[PDB]
Design a protein around this ligand. Sequence first.
Ligand SMILES: NC(=O)c1ccc[n+]([C@@H]2O[C@H](COP(=O)([O-])OP(=O)(O)OC[C@H]3O[C@@H](n4cnc5c(N)ncnc54)[C@H](OP(=O)(O)O)[C@@H]3O)[C@@H](O)[C@H]2O)c1
Ligand SMILES: NC(=O)c1ccc[n+]([C@@H]2O[C@H](COP(=O)([O-])OP(=O)(O)OC[C@H]3O[C@@H](n4cnc5c(N)ncnc54)[C@H](OP(=O)(O)O)[C@@H]3O)[C@@H](O)[C@H]2O)c1
Lengths: 327, 321
Amino acid sequence: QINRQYQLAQRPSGLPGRDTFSFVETPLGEPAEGQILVKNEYLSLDPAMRGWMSYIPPVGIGEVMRALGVGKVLVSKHPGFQAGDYVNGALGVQDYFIGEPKGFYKVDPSRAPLPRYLSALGMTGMTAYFALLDVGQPKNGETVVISGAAGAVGSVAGQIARLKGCRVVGIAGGAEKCRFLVEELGFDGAIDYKNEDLAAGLKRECPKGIDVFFDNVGGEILDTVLTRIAFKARIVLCGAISQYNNKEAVRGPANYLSLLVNRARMEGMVVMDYAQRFPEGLKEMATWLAEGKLQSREDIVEGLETFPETLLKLFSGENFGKLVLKV
Amino acid sequence: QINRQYQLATFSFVETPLGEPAEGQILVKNEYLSLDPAMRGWMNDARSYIPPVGIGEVMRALGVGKVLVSKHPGFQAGDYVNGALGVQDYFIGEPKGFYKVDPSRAPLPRYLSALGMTGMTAYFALLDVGQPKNGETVVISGAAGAVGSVAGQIARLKGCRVVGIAGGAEKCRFLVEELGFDGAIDYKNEDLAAGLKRECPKGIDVFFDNVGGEILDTVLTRIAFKARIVLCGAISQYNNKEAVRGPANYLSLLVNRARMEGMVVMDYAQRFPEGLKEMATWLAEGKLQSREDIVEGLETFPETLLKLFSGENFGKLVLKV
Ligand SMILES: NC(=O)c1ccc[n+]([C@@H]2O[C@H](COP(=O)([O-])OP(=O)(O)OC[C@H]3O[C@@H](n4cnc5c(N)ncnc54)[C@H](OP(=O)(O)O)[C@@H]3O)[C@@H](O)[C@H]2O)c1
Ligand SMILES: NC(=O)c1ccc[n+]([C@@H]2O[C@H](COP(=O)([O-])OP(=O)(O)OC[C@H]3O[C@@H](n4cnc5c(N)ncnc54)[C@H](OP(=O)(O)O)[C@@H]3O)[C@@H](O)[C@H]2O)c1
């Protein structure tokens, strides 16, 4: 049995294209004590990958590329897991995972499709959940603005905010995504940053200011949102995708003093800090899904070999929904 | 009787007749006036936290003074007050945001510094927003200034390691030898990153920012897990003809799961009594020190005013009227 794997060959400069990865065929090993062996089925493609090439150590050169995934346990030398289980874990960009199941959890394939355990019922879902609710602390009637709003995190964030009684405004790229936000996910409004002036969009959509800004994007979008925040607003720093491929320095928010004028808070978060609360998060999210109160879209791309090419879709805005790679 | 005033024209010294207080009003002989950096920010156009001084109107100044006549249920003749008394001999109007100060518990001018606005800013911004704990490392910008020098001393009292950033070898010496800061970084002569690397081994848990600009952006690179950055001001940016700099390292808040939060001292006006009571005991026991640089004569105003961005004020700048 062969285990195909993408390895990190070189730390990339800007956008990471080919020759950044090395496609390698190594023989399938066997798990040691405390380890499990997993047949990888669906891989999560995440903007955080660029950073992996910080809050977590980077990928070692010559190591398998880091990747969250869902897979079938073939064998287990670990009390927590048994052969036949389906697991969410750091499975890597390869056919098969062998190692310590640290922070792995079982998923039930009969209750939801596997790729869902990478979105709304996975990491991106939890990010939206804990970031919005614990850090954003939205309340009934508050104006909630979300960047990267048609994405996996933003789309779930927008909807939970809607369920909390918030007026929800999405900032997204292109007419199709902005239409999706309003007609499908139930956002109160949308701003197409690619086609309309963002400031005028915000003035239109948030005339009395913004109480909660969920930032997935950073850059000029963040800086413009800053001129419009309300007294005691919360800015959740979830990501800065517009900056991840910078050869140049990060674009700092020149309107940051709005946080002073408005006595507002800007706070960062990392989803793994909430691991102890995952079951309660996953449980409540699941009931939202079942009740039709929240919708999750996955964008599945087939074939492990397409990894380098498919990854770039996140940075070109080419993904429509949570990007998943079928192995 | 005459009320000498400075009203916003660069200014204008105009003698005016002393009027008389109506209902809801008090009459106050102004004794000491607060010269604050915020005086500049008040003169701008864009929506600040409080509306600008109107063209032609008496220049805003916080001050301490004696009530001569009260037509207000909360104030009595002979009370001493703190309030927006303005750049003038006498205040007449509603005591919007005034409070009584006990002249027995402290020197009158101290009710403009540690027991006044700058002291309460340090008090509430550090403790409510920074929430420093025993053994945490607390870095203060403008640490020699009126807010920073108090914030750093309260930090010391809470059991923190306290590191100050200040201009000049003299001021840095003062923080360590006189105020009891654990370390000091001379931003004017020394590299800041190296200074911070040196003075803050375990990273930075609380940053009390009075300055913004490059200092903030450098501090961001060494904040710790779950750090708190208190935005109190951005003095290095107030005299900019062009755009505020902006922290390029702000994503440190993400990597470190840290919080950056602004505050305005008057939001805590209702809690001033407990804050002032505690601050008074610290001063009285000699645990916390307050410096005021007092210049005599209202007439010296425009000259005295030219000090707060220079760095010439040693202590809280106060004008005796
Ligand atoms: N802090 C944590 O714990 C944590 C965990 C997971 C993810 N994240 C972060 O959350 C954010 C969203 O991730 P996701 O999984 O939901 O990915 P996603 O939003 O589903 O996909 C990426 C989206 O980013 C937008 N985008 C890319 N470049 C942009 C640019 N230059 N300007 C504006 N928009 C741009 C594109 O949307 P448009 O086509 O609409 O422009 C693209 O569809 C990322 O910043 C990620 O790093 C944080
Ligand atoms: N948010 C609120 O409620 C509130 C209340 C009061 C004050 N503030 C703000 O907090 C700040 C402190 O006010 P303060 O009364 O304590 O004034 P201050 O510190 O007594 O006077 C100015 C001090 O700022 C420092 N400074 C000036 N320009 C600088 C620069 N370019 N780089 C580095 N340091 C510089 C100087 O320190 P060195 O001489 O050592 O360089 C100087 O001592 C101001 O920005 C003020 O507007 C906010």
